[PDB]
Amino acid sequence: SKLQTLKNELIRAISEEKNKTQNNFGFRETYDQFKMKDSAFELLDVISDRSYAPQLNSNTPEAENERNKFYALMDFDQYKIEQFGSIMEALYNENQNHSLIRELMISGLGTQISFELALEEINKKIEIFNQDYLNAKINSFDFTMKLKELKSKLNQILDKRKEWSRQADGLIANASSNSSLSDSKSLAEYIKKRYLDNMQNARQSVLEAYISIM
């Protein structure tokens, strides 16, 4: 079966992606939350009743789970997270950078949440469609188009989650050596000009991809 190949490919790819997002492997959050406890994580409440959405830096298990999505965004790579946290900490000095910091954390954490919801959405749709085909509600051509399109959305979200991640690498390569030694304004300006739009667009793209699967 060409069809069974396609479907199994997909189910495996979704699985591996799902294992990733988890596989801490004894990854441990540092005590200062990679320099973001008293900076970036202070500027937001948990993204995923809303009065009880804890501060993202708090000692609650829901804030920890959310911070763990940020670290998944950065592949549980502790020094990359630290290098990003330290630029956030440099920016936090001037309260006029705070809304940039918040915007940056929304683009990233937002990218990861939509990513993981989309993986789950794709999985659900494969299952529904397979039953529909098992129940002979749909033929193999319809099942194949659906799977192809699901597969294409998977590729869009992977590429875009990676797009964000490389934005973050660029900024780290430039600024994690010296951010707290730099003019804060120039550092903010650099980020806005080089990185912010690419980050926000990675986020929108992944978001719209997830929306288009439901």
CATH code assigned at 8: 1.10.3160.10
Distance CA 5, CA 137 (A): 21
PDB experimental method: X-ray
If one counts every other C-beta atom within 10 angstroms of the C-beta of residue 163, the result is 18
- Residue-range definition of the domain harbouring residue 1: 1-214
Count helices and strands (H / E) in the chain.
7, 0
Number of domains in the chain: 1
Distance CA 56, CA 157 (A): 24
Q: Which residue has the tokens 């790819």?
A: 13
Which distant-in-sequence residues (6+ apart) come within 8 Å of 201 by Cβ?
163
Residue 115 CA to its chain's centroid (Å): 6
Reported resolution in A?
2.2
DSSP string, 120-171: HHHHHHHHHHHHHHHTTSS-HHHHHHHHHHHHHHHHHHHHHHHHHHHHHHHH
If one counts every other C-beta atom within 10 angstroms of the C-beta of residue 17, the result is 19
Distance CA 9, CA 154 (A): 12
